[PDB]
Design a protein around this ligand. Structure first.
Ligand SMILES: [Mg+2]
Lengths: 678, 105
DNA sequence: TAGGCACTGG
DNA sequence: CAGTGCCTA
């Protein structure tokens, strides 16, 4: 087993030069540095570990080091280099599994300061290295009277860089051994720093293998990217901006500008007593100025001020439809009586309240809808074009958006998305959603050989969360709930229980039940907010004893205040639980997350087994995985049909693999883009 | 006997009135404005026949002040034949104002 | 819409 | 950094 790390001249996307690398070999207990002219030897060493059926450990190697080495070997040495997935270990991936209850800077992309809770020490250091190196470079130059350029520290190899490289491997080795010291995931009787790859995966907790496979596949998904219709979004941008201006023109006419205090630097005090008046806006008292400037009658002073005469400095302000403060100011002045305020003390003005607001003036009453529309349009513009993370700012040269994915960003095993967040694109049911979704599609990628548009296969797991509930209930109801889902009407069944009016309300109720929603959210489904919210849940459980039995066995496992602060996930991993009340929900959500994770992994492995190649230079390409659905780009319709049926096969395999008490299914849809494939 | 203007009446009451007119741009929430207010009441009485004192609350009539800039309040503008002849900003004393007026009148 | 990401205002 | 919206049931 070897631990390694490399330093190169840029992020994966534009890297062109290997600066150096370091290898620590457990078999020799020695660190070896490789400088620029040793690139070839570095590669030879990695492949030799592979020849021995060994393991290579990197920190974030799955997303950077491994693919960057393949890219660099080809560019600099005209060599084909492809480390197999089976021989690689990623301490970042392992940390996210073992310390899933903690957040991380995602390798320095996020400001540690904004993250909640504590951060794992070794991991924190690794993620801050680049910024740290940049600060040492910046200094050495600033000390030699030499100018600094934004990112020149990464242009050429140097000994300071080499030192950081070596430090990286020492810290990664420390992290690794710390992770491996966790007996829950690695049996104590085995020295995992002294075994072959097959033994490492087979003898460690199943979750270890699943997380590495998920990370490898998702790294490939990121590199694939999601084909994006830049031109269409630009046209959408023009349309949105025009409607924004017009809405602004109207609203600014309806609500005119006004003045507000600004720049005051002196407390206003009652001239009579001298009593400070902190409530009154700040004033300014001119030190110079007079009626007739300093000297037969003198000359009049053309200045606007007069020494000692105070005034309140003010600035002109124009109505801003995006300012909740301005909206609140203008509406109360119309006869609106704020019913709900915030904790920081302030009128609550979300879209909900704006809908209930009523004012006498008919024009101001109608303007509220214009304000609502302005806020929504502002939302669409920020997301697609003007925000810092706008889609138009992320489209790469290959005409695709390569959004990032943290495979295990949630403690339940659920993944998170960012840069940009491709799991928050407006749905087809939302205003402008159809245009937004149609812009992300396999059709926007023209085959490298034939120029023909690719086709899209959208696959979703069917009612996964409910089926997971059925599965866990089987120990108590012997599969009754699961049978009703597959061959009956679970919703009307849930309606009769908890006694509800519409069967659609049953659905609303259950889907909210699975995602531990407060009693309040339950009430709003009937129209008794937070009131019947306690009654409903209770009546449901009463008529569905298997669920109450489950909740009870779940809490007995945790509460003795705690005998254990986690539940065992489907692959054996610990899943932190915040409160006993959340136990069940955590259980269900984790089951769904892990089933979908293993599912997408098996789906891709089966496709490859069938002879299909993963990549734009191949037959299919994973473009997006959003909770329970995956969107896959396919070179031909025939392939898309194969992907759809293969995904169903993979899901059944997963249900059988984990002895699931409820049958699992998927539903697939073929089409040119995400608007049609959802 | 002070003239309480509105945006709609400003043009006629000020820019077309005969003689000098002292306009006071103020706000209810301004300490300095509340200070000079009673002073304005007195000047209006003592200069009756020689000067016309007018007031414009900028919150009730937001369309006029912008036309003259106004960076602070109270802003006292002396008009003559529909044009600004003199301007002072701040809560002047009855004396400084009396001096400002006599000097400009 | 519970959890995350991200935006605009001040 | 506060107040919100957008996704996912
Ligand atoms: Mg590195």
């Amino acid at each position: 087993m070897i631990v390694s790390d490399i330093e190169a001249n840029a992020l994966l996307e534009s890297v062109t030069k290997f600066h150096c690398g370091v290898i620590y070999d457990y078999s020799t207990a020695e660190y070896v540095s490789y400088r620029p002219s040793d690139f070839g030897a570095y590669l030879d060493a990695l492949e030799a570990e592979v020849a021995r059926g060994g393991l290579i450990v990197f920190h974030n190697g799955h997303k950077y080091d491994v693919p960057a080495l393949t890219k660099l070997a080809k560019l600099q040495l005209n060599r084909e280099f492809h480390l197999p997935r089976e021989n690689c270990i990623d301490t970042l991936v392992l940390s996210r599994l073992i310390h899933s209850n903690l957040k991380d800077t995602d390798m320095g992309l996020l400001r540690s300061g904004k993250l909640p809770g504590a951060l794992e020490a070794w991991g924190y250091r690794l993620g801050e290295m680049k910024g740290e190196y940049k600060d040492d470079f910046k200094r050495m130059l600033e000390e030699q009277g030499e100018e600094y350029v934004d990112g020149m520290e990464w242009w050429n190899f140097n000994e300071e860089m080499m030192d950081y490289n070596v430090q990286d491997v020492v810290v990664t080795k420390a992290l690794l051994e710390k992770l491996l010291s966790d007996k829950h995931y690695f049996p104590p009787e085995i020295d995992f720093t002294d075994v072959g790859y097959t033994t490492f995966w087979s003898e460690s907790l199943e979750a270890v293998d699943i997380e590495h496979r998920a990370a490898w596949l998702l790294a490939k998904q990121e590199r694939n990217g999601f084909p994006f219709d830049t031109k269409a979004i630009e046209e959408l941008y023009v349309e949105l901006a025009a409607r924004r201006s017009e809405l602004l023109r109207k609203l600014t006419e309806t609500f005119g500008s006004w003045y507000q205090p600004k720049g005051g630097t002196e407390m206003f005090c009652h001239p009579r007593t001298g009593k400070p008046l902190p409530k009154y806006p700040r004033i300014k008292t001119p030190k110079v100025g007079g009626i007739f400037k300093k000297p037969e009658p003198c000359e009049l002073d053309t200045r606007e001020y007069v020494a000692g005469a105070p005034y309140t400095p003010v600035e002109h302000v124009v109505f801003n439809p995006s300012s909740r403060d301005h909206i609140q100011k203008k509406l109360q002045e119309a006869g609106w009586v704020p019913t709900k305020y915030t904790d920081k003390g302030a009128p609550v003005v979300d879209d909900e309240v704006l809908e209930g607001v009523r004012v006498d003036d008919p024009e101001k009453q109608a303007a509220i809808d214009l304000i609502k529309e302005y806020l929504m349009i502002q939302k669409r513009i920020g997301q697609s074009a003007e925000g810092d993370k706008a889609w138009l700012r992320y489209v790469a040269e290959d005409g695709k958006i390569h959004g990032s994915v943290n495979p295990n960003g949630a403690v339940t095993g659920r993944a998170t998305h960012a840069f940009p967040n491709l799991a928050q694109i407006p749905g087809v049911r939302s205003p402008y959603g159809e245009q937004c979704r149609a812009a992300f599609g396999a059709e926007h990628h023209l085959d490298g050989i034939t120029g023909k548009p690719w086709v899209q296969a959208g696959i979703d797991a069917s009612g996964l969360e409910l089926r997971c509930l059925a599965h866990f209930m089987a120990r108590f109801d012997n599969g009754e709930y699961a049978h009703e889902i597959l061959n009956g009407d679970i919703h009307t069944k849930n309606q009769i229980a908890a006694e509800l009016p519409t069967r659609d309300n049953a659905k609303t109720f259950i889907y909210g039940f699975l995602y531990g929603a407060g009693d309040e959210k339950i009430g709003q489904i009937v129209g008794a907010g937070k009131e019947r919210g306690k009654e409903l849940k209770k009546k449901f459980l009463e008529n569905t004893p298997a669920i109450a039995a489950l909740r009870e066995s779940i809490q007995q496992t945790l509460v003795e205040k705690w005998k254990r602060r986690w539940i065992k996930g489907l692959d054996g991993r610990k899943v932190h639980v915040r409160s006993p009340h959340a136990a069940l929900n955590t259980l269900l959500q984790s089951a769904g997350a892990l089933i979908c994770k293993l599912w997408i992994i098996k789906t891709e492995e089966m496709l490859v087994e069938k002879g299909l190649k993963h990549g734009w230079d191949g037959d299919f390409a994973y473009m997006a995985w959003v909770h329970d659905e995956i969107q896959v780009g396919c070179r031909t319709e025939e392939i898309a049909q194969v992907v759809i049926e293969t995904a169903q096969e993979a899901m059944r395999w997963v249900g059988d693999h984990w002895n699931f008490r409820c049958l699992l299914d998927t539903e697939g849809k073929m089409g040119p883009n995400w608007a049609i494939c959802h | 006997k002070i003239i309480h203007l509105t945006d709609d009446s400003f043009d006629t009451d000020v820019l077309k009135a005969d003689g000098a007119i002292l306009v006071d741009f103020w706000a209810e929430w301004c300490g300095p404005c509340k200070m000079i207010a009673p002073i304005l009441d007195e000047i209006a009485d003592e200069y009756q026949g020689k000067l016309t004192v007018a007031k414009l609350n900028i919150d009730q009539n937001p369309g006029t002040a912008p036309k003259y800039g106004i960076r602070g309040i109270p802003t006292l503008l002396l008009f003559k034949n529909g044009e600004v002849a003199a301007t002072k900003v701040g809560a002047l004393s009855k004396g400084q104002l009396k001096e400002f007026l006599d000097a400009n009148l």
